[PDB]
From a paper:
The Mitochondrial Complex I Assembly (MCIA) complex is essential for the biogenesis of respiratory Complex I (CI), the first enzyme in the respiratory chain, which has been linked to Alzheimer’s disease (AD) pathogenesis. ECSIT binding induces a major conformational change in the FAD-binding loop of ACAD9, releasing the FAD cofactor and converting ACAD9 from a fatty acid β-oxidation (FAO) enzyme to a CI assembly factor. As previously described, ACAD9 is present as a dimer, where the C-terminal regions (residues 600–621) form helix loops that are positioned around the neighbouring protomer thereby stabilising the active dimer.
An ACAD9-S191A mutant further confirmed the lower affinity for ECSITCTER, though this mutant showed higher stability compared to ACAD9WT, with less dissociation into monomers. Considering the observed stability and compactness of the ACAD9S191A mutant, we chose it as a suitable candidate for further improving the ACAD9 structure. To increase the orientational diversity, we collected a 35° tilted cryo-EM data set and solved the structure of ACAD9S191A at 3.6 Å resolution. Consistent with FAO activity, the structure features one molecule of FAD in the cofactor binding site of each ACAD9 protomer. As expected, no significant density occupies the ECSIT binding site identified in the ACAD9WT-ECSITCTER structure.
Residue numbers in the entry:
A (entry chain B), B (entry chain A): 38 to 449, 487 to 621
Write the structure that this text describes.
Amino acid sequence: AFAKELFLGKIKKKEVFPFPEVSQDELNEINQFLGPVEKFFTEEVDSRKIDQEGKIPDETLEKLKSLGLFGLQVPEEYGGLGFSNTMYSRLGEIISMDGSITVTLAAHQAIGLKGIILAGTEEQKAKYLPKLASGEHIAAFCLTEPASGSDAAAIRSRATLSEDKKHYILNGSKVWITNGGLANIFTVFAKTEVVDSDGSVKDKITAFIVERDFGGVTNGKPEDKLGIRGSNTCEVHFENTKIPVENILGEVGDGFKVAMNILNSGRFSMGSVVAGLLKRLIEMTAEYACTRKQFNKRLSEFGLIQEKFALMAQKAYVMESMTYLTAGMLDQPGFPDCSIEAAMVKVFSSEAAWQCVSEALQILGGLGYTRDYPYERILRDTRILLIFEGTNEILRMYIALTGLQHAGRILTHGVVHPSLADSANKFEENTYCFGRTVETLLLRFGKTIMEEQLVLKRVANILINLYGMTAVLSRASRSIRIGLRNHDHEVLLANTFCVEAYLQNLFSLSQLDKYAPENLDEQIKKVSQQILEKRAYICAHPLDRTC
Amino acid sequence: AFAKELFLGKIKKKEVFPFPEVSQDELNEINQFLGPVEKFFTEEVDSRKIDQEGKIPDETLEKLKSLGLFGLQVPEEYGGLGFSNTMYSRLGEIISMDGSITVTLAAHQAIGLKGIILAGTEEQKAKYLPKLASGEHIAAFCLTEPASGSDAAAIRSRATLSEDKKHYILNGSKVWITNGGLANIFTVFAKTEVVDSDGSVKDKITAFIVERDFGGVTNGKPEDKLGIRGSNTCEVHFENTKIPVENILGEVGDGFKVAMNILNSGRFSMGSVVAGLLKRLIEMTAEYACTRKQFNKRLSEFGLIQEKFALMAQKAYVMESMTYLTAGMLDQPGFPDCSIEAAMVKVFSSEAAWQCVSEALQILGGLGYTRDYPYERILRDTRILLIFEGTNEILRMYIALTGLQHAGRILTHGVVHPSLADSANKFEENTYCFGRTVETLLLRFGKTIMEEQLVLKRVANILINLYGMTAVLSRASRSIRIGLRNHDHEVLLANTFCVEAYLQNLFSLSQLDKYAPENLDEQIKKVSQQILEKRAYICAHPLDRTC
Ligand SMILES: Cc1cc2nc3c(=O)[nH]c(=O)nc-3n(C[C@H](O)[C@H](O)[C@H](O)COP(=O)(O)OP(=O)(O)OC[C@H]3O[C@@H](n4cnc5c(N)ncnc54)[C@H](O)[C@@H]3O)c2cc1C
Ligand SMILES: Cc1cc2nc3c(=O)[nH]c(=O)nc-3n(C[C@H](O)[C@H](O)[C@H](O)COP(=O)(O)OP(=O)(O)OC[C@H]3O[C@@H](n4cnc5c(N)ncnc54)[C@H](O)[C@@H]3O)c2cc1C
């Protein structure tokens, strides 16, 4: 991957900078495909009715099955469409208009049946995948226990062999699974004892493809969510579940690798989702500011709405750069390992989504707060993307933790257009200084870097900014060389983000020094310790007096 | 006030560093009153049922009337409680828990009947205030029309003087008037022709105390609000309203000044309302931060949760400093024009509220997004504070130019405790250079500063941070000298805020120079104007290519 090489202080030239280019025929045929898709979301989708009622209408879901979006990444031989990673991102740019169905389909494709394709047996593939991609079967990714979440190694669901050793018995419950109410196939992750030459009785996690027809799998009442009322998040209890031995992934005991790959192979497309959302915002607020008058003038002439529009456009553009570069590096021959960059795209998309949606509702003022306008649904559904597919704080570790281990093992520019000359120099300076800082950080902490949960956050921020800046440089250089329309606008959108990210990175890199007077790590530690040991607020009220 | 002297480069040390101190008898009286108030709010209020149903129950509102809480800033002779400013903030900290009720009370007290006390006559006061503060009459502040929330100098409500000289006739419609559904007294603001010696027929803004019993005033259907569903925000229509000639504030032709003075006196309370929220959150999450297991450890042992808790505590402490210093400035003899400070505290409180509520729901992760937990209600209700009593976006103009206009006319440190030495050494610096910058602006921009609103926003940020830093310095110095419990915790919070605000203000001041390459005023302007002319996102997809 490109991210893993950032820590060593080297930038892989002749790579990333040539932006992924798609030939004409795929683009033409996918416009022919998106015709009906865009039409169907525009006419037949009643977003307000779905959000208010909280139940997806049967006709809409049936038509969605008919268009076959359930198998976008499924290979053609198994009834899928075989769209590449880039094409999935392009279709996800427009799939996000509803807001509720996007989560259901991300659960069905990105994570749900991803396990069968990644590590399932060929017989299991032929048995299940053609029916899953057709839409009759829906996959739900059951991983979390009521007292679980991150660090799923500690699951309390027991699966054990039977006397005849011909079928497994499973008993457990799962709490937060998207589309668990209607799903007919679950990728349950449970625990089972394993025996080896040492005679050990260690317990290891294993996967299980479980149907609702096996019996003993029961569903509870759907949980009344805040924003995406369309999704059907439920409770599943497995009591006395009988599983034939053929329903297992890889080999018994290797559940951690499958779980990690499933989580790490489906977070880049989300980055495009937000981008599409932001487009809709600038398709609805821009107009309003034109039909509303203040200071005897239209709203658009004020500089303080102009800066908000520029910020929204900058976030959308940088987000598109991230998503499409990441989806273009996954289409190379083989199986490249670019799980970090999907995390970068996910984190940046969530942050920019929250900031820009808050600002957009602010521009509409008091009018946007009511439900007559649809800005409620956008704000409520934008929140979940920070929670969805793992929290941002975990991915802040994953970007730093996994990359630094690769960095630790090793220790133990005429490509951009002349118009963007300053951005290349700033990117080179940031990469060099950041490499030196990471080298010093690994030298000083050594192996104790795990507990420095604050340092990893700053390193993750710097890495996300560097990846954003380099993706934007690559996209702008392509747009200039091809001579695409409005190339000066995209040059300005590149330079603004380059200056902003350079300032932020220079701030973050400065406070990662041994003798930095601005290093505010101990103060936060002490204060947080005080509140956490008291478990309430500390400071007494100003009114009270004690001589 | 203290803020107006900041731009000249001089610190009003006598006014703000000796922190306001309440006498023992007054403190005993206020605790005696909060006793029953805290009991009633804790045991009787059913926040979830009010939020879900959207209608305030009759019994709880009647009990609130029995407590006589609708009037507390009312003078004691007019049935009021005669509470001072600091007592209002302290009782706001308590009433902040419900969320729906605080909006109704702010509409009744801070804005609604504030006009009668500020500019009403003795006869009008004796006629209306005793019934208003009793609870059987509620005042609603009608200022906005379908197309006029800001710049009220452009209202289209027509009030004309009848030929008999004894009645005014009023016709108009108002939108987004808090508690307009049940209010029986309106401070309607309209326009009426005025005749002078010059023979002009110009229209001037006038106020009108209007009763529902007059006739021709109709209530529309309540707006279906997003979060604060308890408060009844409705539509009020004035069709042929007859107004007796004695219901005018001040004199005919001074409605704009009365409106401005009403608005500029009720924005410090919600500086501490958020405190009465955030402290509760720092408790409500803290329990959850110790009753869940991850990585085999309590979440409180992680760095990120520690950082979030310290941030929440810091914001709560700074808002306490701002609100109580501002409430102590007002209680001095006379009524100094502290219009800047109230707006400043409001905007800082709103920003910190949004940030901290986002972080707090993030800590609870997937459980917080559920409607069962009360974190959903807090997130939905915290939105209004970026809108209510006018948006915080325009309140960044009063803070920006009300001092510059004051500074324009003029141009045409042993009090702090030694422990907080270096922080004070920063504060003076963060003022001194700042003053120079301001005066340089008054040269370079001449009188054109109004239109270049980005500079105004930057100056607003610098001033807000300076006031926050000086307020926390003064409060921490008082707490050290008196010897309150956990004073070292207060010192740590004060030092953290001083360093953070100094960094942010140095960044803001560094980019206000002409020869600073950190300036983005021109590029943002160009990008925003391009987008606004295009009416939508102008940049195209990267998949599309041109031969
Ligand atoms: C729950 C609620 C409570 C309310 N309470 C009150 C109340 O107590 N009193 C009251 O008077 N109104 C109140 N309002 C009305 C509110 O202030 C809005 O003005 C109203 O909803 C309609 O105004 P608008 O959308 O036309 O505002 P606009 O000003 O048209 O909104 C456009 C946005 O552009 C920006 N902007 C506007 N003018 C300027 C400028 N000159 N310079 C720079 N930026 C600018 C601001 O961000 C503004 O929000 C309330 C509204 C709601 C929803
Ligand atoms: C809509 C939705 C969709 C979901 N989809 C899935 C899914 O596809 N797959 C799945 O497995 N689960 C999924 N979940 C479950 C979710 O990931 C968690 O299991 C759930 O929030 C349970 O609470 P928690 O363990 O995250 O508690 P939390 O306290 O929220 O745990 C995560 C948070 O705790 C802190 N934290 C945790 N670990 C660390 C650490 N090592 N270092 C620092 N801080 C840390 C951080 O603040 C982090 O944000 C979903 C949940 C929801 C609501």
